[PDB]
């Protein structure tokens, strides 16, 4: 009746480094990207990862100090040591940075920037703007503002490149 803890099935535990330990110069960062409980990268070695948190943008490189970031709807960039850039777009979630050389970005929804379309965003933005005036109450206005902000961020990311 010793209920096996669900985490025990997952043997890929997090590698945390002790404070007093000697330093190691790392050349790659182990990135773990997850969408709706589905990982796209499994401890992939990358040169750097750019993530847009609440306060601002962050460029995470190997050896970055341990930190927790609350992401916002925005693009995410991954640059490999080879010299290849891969861009996704996330709607939210958290990013955990470890001083040991790991970065786990678990987002509610992470989709390729290519999969998104421009005209679809434009029409949706117009509809939300029209519906904002006809908002039932304050809560509806805030919800529409959230939707508008997400669409604007998507459009800005597409127009950037």
């Amino acid at each position: 009746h010793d209920l096996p803890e669900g985490f025990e099935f997952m043997e890929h535990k997090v590698v945390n480094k002790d404070i007093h330990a000697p330093h190691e110069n790392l050349e790659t960062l182990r990135l773990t990207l997850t969408r709706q409980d589905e990982f796209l990268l499994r401890e992939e070695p990358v040169k750097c990862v750019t993530v847009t948190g609440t306060n601002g943008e962050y460029g995470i490189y190997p050896g970055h100090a341990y930190k927790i970031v609350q992401l916002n709807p925005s693009p995410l960039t991954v640059e490999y040591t080879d010299g290849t850039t891969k861009k996704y777009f996330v709607s939210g979630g958290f990013a955990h940075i470890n001083n040991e050389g790991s970065c786990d970005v678990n987002t509610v929804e992470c989709t390729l920037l290519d999969d998104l379309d421009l005209a679809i965003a434009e029409k949706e933005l117009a509809a939300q703007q029209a519906a904002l005036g006809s908002a039932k109450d304050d809560k509806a206005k805030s919800v529409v503002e959230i939707r508008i902000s997400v669409i604007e961020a998507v459009i800005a990311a597409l127009k950037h490149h």
Binding site: L3, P4, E5, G6, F9, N16, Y66, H96
Partner: protein, 51 residues
């Protein structure tokens, strides 16, 4: 609520299915335990993450 315990089923292989449990300590007491993980040497795996 002191805790929320989710009991579900886990699928190891095509036929080996077991019962698994997720415990979610209520925030109020999770904050208190995160305190011990930040100060005392106790809980070393959760020292950096806690900090």
């Amino acid at each position: 609520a002191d805790r929320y315990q989710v009991i579900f089923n886990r699928f190891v292989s095509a036929g080996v299915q077991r019962n698994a449990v997720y415990n979610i300590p209520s925030y109020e007491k999770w904050k208190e335990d995160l305190a011990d993980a930040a100060s005392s040497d106790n809980q070393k795996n959760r020292y950096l993450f806690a900090n």
